[PDB]
Design a protein around this motif. Structure first.
Motif, PDB file in Angstrom:
ATOM      1  N   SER A  29       0.837  -1.172   0.000  1.00 33.28           N
ATOM      2  CA  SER A  29       0.000   0.000   0.000  1.00 33.28           C
ATOM      3  C   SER A  29       0.878   1.229   0.000  1.00 33.28           C
ATOM      4  O   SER A  29       2.101   1.172   0.073  1.00 33.28           O
ATOM      5  CB  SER A  29      -0.931  -0.006   1.212  1.00 33.28           C
TER       6      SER A  29
ATOM      7  N   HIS B  59      -0.602   7.897   0.616  1.00 35.43           N
ATOM      8  CA  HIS B  59      -1.335   8.612  -0.454  1.00 35.43           C
ATOM      9  C   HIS B  59      -1.430  10.088  -0.211  1.00 35.43           C
ATOM     10  O   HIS B  59      -1.770  10.870  -1.122  1.00 35.43           O
ATOM     11  CB  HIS B  59      -2.720   7.970  -0.681  1.00 35.43           C
TER      12      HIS B  59
ATOM     13  N   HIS C  40      -6.511   2.667  -2.012  1.00 32.74           N
ATOM     14  CA  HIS C  40      -5.320   3.467  -2.309  1.00 32.74           C
ATOM     15  C   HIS C  40      -5.408   4.985  -2.464  1.00 32.74           C
ATOM     16  O   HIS C  40      -4.472   5.611  -2.994  1.00 32.74           O
ATOM     17  CB  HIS C  40      -4.609   2.826  -3.505  1.00 32.74           C
TER      18      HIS C  40
ATOM     19  N   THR D 255       5.618   3.743  -1.328  1.00 34.53           N
ATOM     20  CA  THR D 255       4.961   2.499  -0.951  1.00 34.53           C
ATOM     21  C   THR D 255       5.644   1.783   0.207  1.00 34.53           C
ATOM     22  O   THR D 255       6.803   2.002   0.505  1.00 34.53           O
ATOM     23  CB  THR D 255       4.956   1.483  -2.105  1.00 34.53           C
TER      24      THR D 255
END
Lengths: 165, 135
Positions: free
Chosen positions: A51, A54, A70, A157
């Protein structure tokens, strides 16, 4: 130990940046601690591995944990529902505090943020549950990919993650 | 910002007392409410004494619209970024859970979220409900 330690290995557009580890205060917020610890090991068959962070706001925080959509609109806890704010004992005292993101009171899922500054005004609105142990410099590096509205300039990530000990 | 004037209010009071709930109340309300904040809109409505049944019909419309607004505007994830103002909820637009400078910010942010115009539209739909019942 009573408080578990979790690590994230961070990558930027696939390239290794470094490792950040956290102490999780299971001794103060055991339900919130256990959620993030289990999402970090993948033991429930879903979680944080792969993940992305973001939303990164320089001089404020780095936010992640939406491993279902996401982009902030997803996330899910290990409890099969969003879960209550456990307590607000611990405070947002400076860089490296680990705290829950939410969409209002008693809406904890899987999103979290890492403070890169003192954010005392969040006290009583976000449940603090851990702190960066090693790798604050990696957090500081990650901050350089953010922007005032949180959009990131590269894909930040969690390339791998789990429990130490 | 200047809170609405006793002068404008007196006028809305005189309007509602004479015309009861004839169609004419609506264009009047719109004129007297130009540029109002939610707080000002509620001060105009609170000035109405009596007409309790009709006032409850308006409230029901306001509550319904506010809940519709929430349904169509999911809350963004917190924490709010520094400097940024949170997005208004239904109750914020209707003035129950917001302050006056918040209303002002939204109305004067970039671009505006015109919480006064929004709330005024809900009020208008409630006044239409009242006018169709009474006239």
């Amino acid at each position: 130990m009573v408080n578990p330690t979790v690590f994230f290995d961070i990558a930027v557009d696939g390239e290794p940046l470094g490792r950040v580890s956290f102490e999780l205060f299971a001794d103060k917020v055991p339900k919130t601690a256990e959620n993030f610890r289990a999402l970090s090991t993948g033991e429930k068959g879903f979680g944080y591995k792969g993940s992305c962070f973001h939303r990164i706001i320089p001089g404020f925080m780095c936010q992640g944990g939406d491993f279902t959509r996401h982009n902030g609109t997803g996330g899910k806890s290990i409890y099969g529902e969003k879960f209550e704010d456990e307590n607000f004992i611990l405070k947002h005292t400076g860089p490296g505090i680990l705290s829950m993101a939410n969409a209002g009171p008693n809406t904890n899922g899987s999103q979290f943020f890492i403070c890169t500054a003192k954010t005392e005004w969040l006290d009583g609105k976000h449940v603090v549950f851990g702190k960066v142990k090693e790798g604050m410099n990696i957090v500081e590096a990650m901050e350089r990919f953010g922007s005032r509205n949180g959009k990131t300039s590269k894909k930040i990530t969690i390339a791998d993650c789990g429990q130490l000990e | 910002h200047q809170a609405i004037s006793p002068r404008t209010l007196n006028a809305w009071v005189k309007v509602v007392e004479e015309k009861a709930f004839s169609p004419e109340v609506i264009p009047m309300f719109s004129a007297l409410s130009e540029g109002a904040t939610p707080q000002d809109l509620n001060t105009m409505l609170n000035t109405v004494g009596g007409h309790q049944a009709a006032m409850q019909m308006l409230k029901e419309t306001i509550n319904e619209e506010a809940a519709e607004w929430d349904r169509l505007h999911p809350v963004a994830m917190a924490p709010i970024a520094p400097g940024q103002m949170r997005e208004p909820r239904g109750s914020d637009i209707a003035g129950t859970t917001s302050t006056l400078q918040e209303q002002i910010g939204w109305m004067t942010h970039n671009p505006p979220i015109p919480v006064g115009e929004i709330y005024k539209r809900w009020i208008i739909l409630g006044l239409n409900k009242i006018v169709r019942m009474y006239s």
